[PDB]
C-alpha cells in the first residue's frame, strides 16, 4: 500500500534515528568519562545516612481506586474519536445514540462522585 510506504515508513525510520541519537548520548560519557566506582559511591542515597531498607517493599497506593476508574474512562472516550471524525456524516440515530451513551457515562460519573470514590483512601 502506498499510504503505508509514504506515511508510515518514515515513522519507522525516525524511530530508529531518534533511538540512535539517544543511545549515542549515553555512550558518550560511558566511553569518555572516568569510571571509578567504590562501595560508598554506588550505595543508595538517603540524604547522608544509610537507607533503612531498599525500595522493594509493599506501599499503600491511596489512589488505587481512581486508577481502576481511569481504565474504564479511557475506553469511554475512545468511542468518541470515530464519532468526532465522522461528525459530518452522522445520521440522527448516530448523533443521539452518542448522547445516550454519554448520558450513561455521566450517571456512572455522578455515582462515583457521590459515593466518594474520587477521594483518596
Partner 1 sequence: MMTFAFYLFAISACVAGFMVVIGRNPVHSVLWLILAFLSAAGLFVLQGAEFVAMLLVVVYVGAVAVLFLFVVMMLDVDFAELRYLPLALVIGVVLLAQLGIAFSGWTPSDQAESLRAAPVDAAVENTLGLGLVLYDRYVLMFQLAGLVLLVAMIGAIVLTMRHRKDVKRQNVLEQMWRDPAKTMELKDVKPGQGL
Partner 2 sequence: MIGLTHYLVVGAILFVTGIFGIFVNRKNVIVILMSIELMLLAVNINFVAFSTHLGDLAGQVFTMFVLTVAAAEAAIGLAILVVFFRNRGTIAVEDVNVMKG
Partner 3 sequence: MAEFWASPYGFALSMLLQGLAVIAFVMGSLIFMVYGDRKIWAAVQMRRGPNVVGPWGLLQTFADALKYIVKEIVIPAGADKFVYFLAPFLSMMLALFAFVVIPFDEGWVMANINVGILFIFAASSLEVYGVIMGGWASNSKYPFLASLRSAAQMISYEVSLGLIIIGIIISTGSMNLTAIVEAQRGDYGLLNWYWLPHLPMVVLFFVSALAECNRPPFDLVEAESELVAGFMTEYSSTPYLLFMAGEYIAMYLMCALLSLLFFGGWLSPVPFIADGWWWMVIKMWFWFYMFAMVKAIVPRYRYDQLMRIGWKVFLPLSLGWVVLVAILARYEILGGFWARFA
Ligand X SMILES: CCCCCCCCCCCCCCCCCC(=O)OC[C@H](COP(=O)(O)O)OC(=O)CCCCCCCCCCCCCCCCC
In the complex, the residues that contact partner 1 under the rule CB under 8 A are 1, 3-4, 8, 12, 56-61, 64-65, 67-72, 74-76, 78-79, 81-83, 85-86, 89-91, 93-94, 97-98, 100-101, 104-105, 107-108, 111-112, 115-117, 119-121
Element (H, E) at 10: helix 9-32
Return the C-alpha torsion angle 76, 79, 84, 86, nearest 10.
-170
Residue 105 · residue 76 · CB < 8 Å: yes
Element (H, E) at 27: helix 9-32
Residue 8 is given by DSSP the state: I
Site residues (vs partner 3, CB under 8 A): 6-11, 13-15, 17-19, 21-23, 25-26, 28-30, 32-37, 39, 41-47, 51, 54-56, 59, 61-63, 66-67, 70, 73-74, 77-78, 80-81, 84-85, 87-88, 90, 95, 98-99, 102, 105-106, 109, 113, 118, 120
Amino acid at each position: 500500500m502506498e499510504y503505508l510506504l509514504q506515511e508510515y515508513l518514515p515513522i519507522l525510520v525516525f524511530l530508529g534515528m531518534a533511538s540512535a541519537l539517544a543511545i549515542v548520548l549515553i555512550l558518550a560519557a560511558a566511553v569518555i568519562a572516568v569510571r571509578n566506582p567504590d562501595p560508598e559511591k554506588v550505595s543508595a542515597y538517603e540524604c547522608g545516612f544509610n537507607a533503612f531498607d531498599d525500595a522493594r517493599m509493599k506501599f499503600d497506593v491511596r489512589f488505587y481506586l481512581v486508577s481502576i476508574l481511569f481504565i474504564i474512562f479511557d475506553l469511554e472516550v475512545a468511542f468518541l474519536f470515530p464519532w468526532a471524525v465522522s461528525f459530518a456524516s452522522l445520521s440522527d440515530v448516530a448523533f443521539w445514540g452518542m448522547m445516550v451513551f454519554l448520558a450513561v457515562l455521566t450517571v456512572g460519573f455522578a455515582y462515583e462522585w457521590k459515593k466518594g470514590a474520587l477521594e483518596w483512601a
